[PDB]
C-alpha cells in the first residue's frame, strides 16, 4: 500500500521492500575491484556518488549523463515492485563498479568484507541528518508517516527510523576502518573544502587527474550544479516514489541549517542524549562551519 | 553593400561603418570610473569582457545573462545601419561602465587618457591572432574578402587588415602602460592559469571576491562554458553580420594551434619579419604553452 510500516531484521528497522531484497542479496558476489559507497541516510550519498562517478569517467560529463545516478551506482539493497532490484541492476554494471548502501554492518553481505572491497564512508552531523531525513520522509512516500518534527526527532534519537540508529551507524563504520580499507569522510569537510576532499578520494582509489579536470569535477559536484542536473537530483523518478513538490531531494545542501528547525528545548535534550551516546567514541563532528 | 573595402583614417585601415562612428565619438565623454577593455582583434576581447562583467556583477550569473556581452560591454567605435552605435548604447549604460575598443592610440578619444580611465589590455601571440583573424574574416561578412590564407597572412604582416598593424598595436599600448594605469595581460597566460589572471584583474579594479566565487568565475569564463553561453558566443547576432556555419566565433580557444595552419615556408618568412618588427621591444610572447 502507501507509507507502510517499517520491518525489523536483526534489530534494524527497514523499509519493507528493502528487507525483502536481503534474501536475494545473500547470493551477491563482490569483486576485488568494487568500491562501496556507504552512508547513514542523508549524509551525502548522492553527492559522493557523483564525485566518484566523475572520477571513474575521467571527468567526462557526457558519460556521467548516460543515466541517473541510481542507475550508474546501483543501490545494493534497493527493491520495488516491477523494477529490477539494485542487485539485478548490478548484473549488467561493468567493472570497476561503484555500489551504494545504507545497511548497518549487521546486514552487510559478508562477501564485501572478505573481498576487501574499498569503502568510501561519509558521515554528517546528526542534527543536519535528522532535519534532512525529516524532509526526505515527507517526499519519499515509501517511508512511514513521519509525524510532527518533534515526534520524528524523538524516533530519530532512539533509532526508530528507516535503517536504524545514526549513532550506531557512524560509530561501527568508524571502527571498521581499522581492519578494513575505509576512507571516512565528513559532509562538513566537503562543504568546507570540496577540492581537498575530492583529492583524498582520488588518492584512495589510486587515480590521478589533471589539475584542471579536478577543478572541473569540483564545479560539477557542487550543490548548485547537482541540483539542476536531472541525472542527480532525482526528478526523473515517478512522483509516486518521490514527490519533489513536497520537498526537493536537493533541499538546501548546507551545513548548520539545523538551527532554524531545532527549538531550544529540543536542542538541549538532544545534546544531553548525544553526549551519552557518543561518550566512548573518538569521532568528532562539526554542527556548522 | 557586402564585404566593402576598408577605409583609411589617419593611417589606420578601418571597417567603413566604424570609420563613420569616429565622427560622433569625438563628443564621447569618459568618466573617471570607466574601465576600458582594449585589444587588437582576436586576442581575447570577449573572454576578458565576460571575466570583468562577472566580477562587476559579483559573480552573479543571472545578472550576466541580462543581455549579450556586446550589450553589457558597449563596443565604443561600433556602428551599423539601423542599430544604435556603441556610443549610443553607452548613453544608457549604468556606471561603473565597462567599455570595449580595438582602436589604435591614434584614433582613441583623448577623453579616455585625460580622465585616467583604467585600462585592461590583452595581447595574444601574432600567429594565433593571424589564424583566428583569418577565420573571423570569413564569418564576419562586414570584412572585405580575406582571400587565400597565404594572401591574408601577407596582408596581416603589413598591417593591411581591419584595425591595422598587430605589431604596432601591441607595442604602443605596452608603452602606454608607463604613463597610464594599464594592466597588460597575455591570452596565453590566461590559458595557462585562468585563476591567477582573474586574481590580477580583481586587484587592478580594486575589488575582492570569496575564494569560492572566484573559482566560480573561472569556470564560467572557460572556453567550454563561454562557447555554449549564447550571451557570449555571438550566436544571437543576425547571420548577415556573423555566419557561424562558416566559422564559429568561439572557434577553438587554444594557444599553439597556429601550427596546423602555418606552412613551414610561411613560418620561416614570418619569424624573420617578426624579429625585425619586434627588435627594440621588451615585450615577450609565447607561441604555445
Ligand atoms: N552537491 C551537494 N552539495 C551539498 N549537499 C548536497 C549535494 N548534493 C546533495 N546534497 C545534500 O545531501 C543530502 C542528501 O543526502 P543523501 O544523498 O545521502 O540522501 C541533502 O541535504 P539537505 O536535505 O540538508 O539539503 C542534499 O541537499
Ligand atoms: N573563454 C575563452 N577561452 C579561451 N579562448 C576564448 C575564450 N573565449 C573566446 N576565446 C577565443 O578568443 C578569440 C576571439 O577573440 P576576441 O573575442 O578578441 O575576438 C577566439 O580564438 P580562436 O579563433 O583561436 O578560437 C575565441 O575562440
Question: Which set of grid coordinates corresponds to residue B140?
Answer: 564576419
Residue from B289, B15, B249, B277 nearest B169 by CA: B277
What are the residue ranges of helices labelled H in A85-210? 86-89, 110-114, 126-139, 149-157, 166-176, 187-192, 194-204
Residue B180 class from Cβ within 10 Å (0-12 exposed, 13-18 middle, 19+ buried)? middle
Backbone torsions φ then ψ of A183, nearest 5 degrees: -95, 110
Residues 6+ apart with CB under 8 A from A113: A180
* Three-state secondary-structure class, residue A171: helix
Question: Which residues from A are below 8 Å from B215, CB to CB?
Answer: 215, 218-219
CB of A229 within 6 A of ligand 1: the answer is no
Backbone torsions φ then ψ of B42, nearest 5 degrees: 65, 30
CB contact under 8 A, B218 and A218: no
List % helix, strand, coil for chain B (3-state, nearest 5): 45, 10, 45
- Structural domains in chain A, CATH included, are 1-289 (3.40.50.300)
Beta strands in chain A (DSSP E): 7-9, 12-14, 35-39, 98-101, 118-123, 182-186
Q: CB of B215 within 8 Å of any CB in chain A?
A: yes
For A30, A94, A223, the CA distances from A98, given in Å and listed in that order, are 11, 9, 21
Alpha-carbon gap, residue A38 to A102, rounded angstroms: 6
Residue A289 class from Cβ within 10 Å (0-12 exposed, 13-18 middle, 19+ buried)? exposed
Chain B residue with minimal CA distance to A212? B193
Task: Work out whether strand B182-186 and strand A35-39 pair parallel, antiparallel, or are unpaired.
Answer: unpaired
- Longest distance between any two alpha carbons in chain A, whole Å: 50
Q: Which ligand has an atom closest to residue B101 CA? A: 2
A282: left (phi over 0), alpha (psi -120 to 50) or beta: alpha
CB B121 within 8 A of CB B136: no
DSSP state of B108: S
Alpha-carbon gap, residue B153 to A171, rounded angstroms: 69
CB A25 within 8 A of CB A192: no
Per the DSSP assignment, residues forming a β-bridge with A119 are A36, A182
CB A197 within 8 A of CB A185: yes
Alpha-carbon gap, residue B64 to B59, rounded angstroms: 8
Question: Which set of grid coordinates corresponds to residue A100?
Answer: 551504494
**Ligand 2, atom nearest to B49 Cα:** 17
Binding residues of B: 42-47, 100-102, 124, 132, 187, 221-226, 249-253
Q: Rounded to the nearest 5 degrees, what angle is found at the Cα of B141, between the Cα atoms of B138 and B145?
A: 60
Residues 6+ apart with CB under 8 A from A123: A39, A40, A43, A170, A173, A174, A184, A185, A186, A187, A283, A285
Residues 6+ apart with CB under 8 A from A157: A270, A273
**Ligand 1, atom nearest to A232 Cα:** 8
Q: Directed axis angle between helix B211-220 and helix B45-56, to 10°?
A: 150
> Which residue's alpha carbon is nearest to atom 10 within ligand 2?
B253
Show which residues of A are catalytic: 102
ω into residue A161 within 30 of 0, thus cis? no
DSSP letter for each residue of B207-242: ----HHHHHHHHHHTSHHHHHH-TTTS-TTS-TTTB
Q: Which ligand has an atom closest to residue B49 CA? A: 2
Alpha-carbon gap, residue B209 to B55, rounded angstroms: 8
Per the DSSP assignment, residues forming a β-bridge with A38 are A101, A121
> Which residue's alpha carbon is nearest to atom 19 within ligand 1?
A42
> Which residue's alpha carbon is nearest to atom 6 within ligand 1?
A253
Residue with cell 584614433: B107
Range A83-86, long-range pairs (CB < 8 A, 24+ positions):
A85/A21, A85/A24, A86/A21
A216 CB neighbour count, 10 Å cutoff: 19
Ligand 1: centre distance to CA A187 (Å): 9
> Which residue's alpha carbon is nearest to atom 8 within ligand 2?
B47
Tell me how close the Cα of A188 comes to any Cα of chain B, in angstroms.
16
CB B188 within 8 A of CB B125: yes
* Three-state secondary-structure class, residue A98: strand
Residue to substitute in A38, A41, A43, A44 for testing ligand 1 pocket (most ligand atoms within 8 angstroms of CB)? A44
Residues in chain A: 289
Backbone torsions φ then ψ of A103, nearest 5 degrees: -55, 135
Question: Which set of grid coordinates corresponds to residue B213?
Answer: 566565487
Tell me how close the Cα of B212 comes to any Cα of chain A, in angstroms.
9
Residues 6+ apart with CB under 8 A from B151: none
Distance, CA of A73 to chain centre = 12
Alpha-carbon gap, residue B28 to A252, rounded angstroms: 48
To one decimal place, what's the resolution in Å? Answer: 2.3
Task: Work out whether strand A35-39 and strand A118-123 pair parallel, antiparallel, or are unpaired.
Answer: parallel
Residue with cell 590521478: A208
For A42, B36, B162, the CA distances from B176, given in Å and listed in that order, are 58, 13, 22
Per the DSSP assignment, residues forming a β-bridge with A123 are A186
Alpha-carbon gap, residue A68 to A230, rounded angstroms: 7
CB A63 within 8 A of CB A213: no
Backbone torsions φ then ψ of B122, nearest 5 degrees: -125, 130
Residues 6+ apart with CB under 8 A from A209: A55, A58, A59, A202, A217
Residue from B36, B45, B43, B73 nearest B57 by CA: B73
Residue from A13, A42, A266 nearest A154 by CA: A266
Amino acid at each position: 500500500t502507501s507509507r507502510p510500516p517499517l520491518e525489523y531484521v536483526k534489530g534494524v528497522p527497514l523499509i519493507k521492500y528493502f528487507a525483502e531484497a536481503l534474501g536475494p542479496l545473500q547470493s551477491f558476489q563482490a569483486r576485488p575491484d568494487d568500491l562501496l559507497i556507504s552512508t547513514y541516510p542523508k549524509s551525502g550519498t548522492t553527492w559522493v556518488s557523483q564525485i566518484l562517478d566523475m572520477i571513474y569517467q575521467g571527468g567526462d560529463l557526457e558519460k556521467c549523463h548516460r543515466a541517473p545516478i541510481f542507475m550508474r551506482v546501483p543501490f545494493l539493497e534497493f527493491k520495488a515492485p516491477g523494477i529490477p532490484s539494485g542487485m539485478e541492476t548490478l548484473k549488467d554494471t561493468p567493472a570497476p563498479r561503484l555500489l551504494k548502501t545504507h545497511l548497518p554492518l549487521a546486514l552487510l553481505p559478508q562477501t564485501l568484507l572478505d573481498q576487501k572491497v574499498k569503502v568510501v564512508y561519509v558521515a554528517r552531523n546528526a542534527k543536519d541528518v535528522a532535519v534532512s531525513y525529516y524532509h526526505f520522509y515527507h517526499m519519499a512516500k515509501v517511508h512511514p508517516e513521519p509525524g510532527t518534527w518533534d515526534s520524528f526527532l524523538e524516533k530519530f534519537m532512539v533509532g526508530e527510523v528507516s535503517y536504524g540508529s545514526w549513532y550506531q551507524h557512524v560509530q561501527e563504520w568508524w571502527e571498521l576502518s581499522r581492519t578494513h580499507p575505509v576512507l571516512y569522510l565528513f559532509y562538513e569537510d566537503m562543504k568546507e573544502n570540496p577540492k581537498r576532499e575530492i583529492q583524498k578520494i582520488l588518492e584512495f582509489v589510486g587515480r590521478s587527474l589533471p589539475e584542471e579536470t579536478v577543478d572541473f569535477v569540483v564545479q560539477h559536484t557542487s550543490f548548485k550544479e547537482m541540483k539542476k542536473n536531472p541525472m542527480t537530483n532525482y526528478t526523473t523518478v515517478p512522483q509516486e516514489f518521490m514527490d519533489h513538490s513536497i520537498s526537493p531531494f536537493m533541499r538546501k545542501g548546507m551545513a548548520g541549517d539545523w538551527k532554524t528547525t531545532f527549538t531550544v528545548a529540543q536542542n538541549e535534550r538532544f545534546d544531553a542524549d548525544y553526549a551519552e551516546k557518543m561518550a566512548g567514541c573518538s569521532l568528532s563532528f562539526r554542527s556548522e562551519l
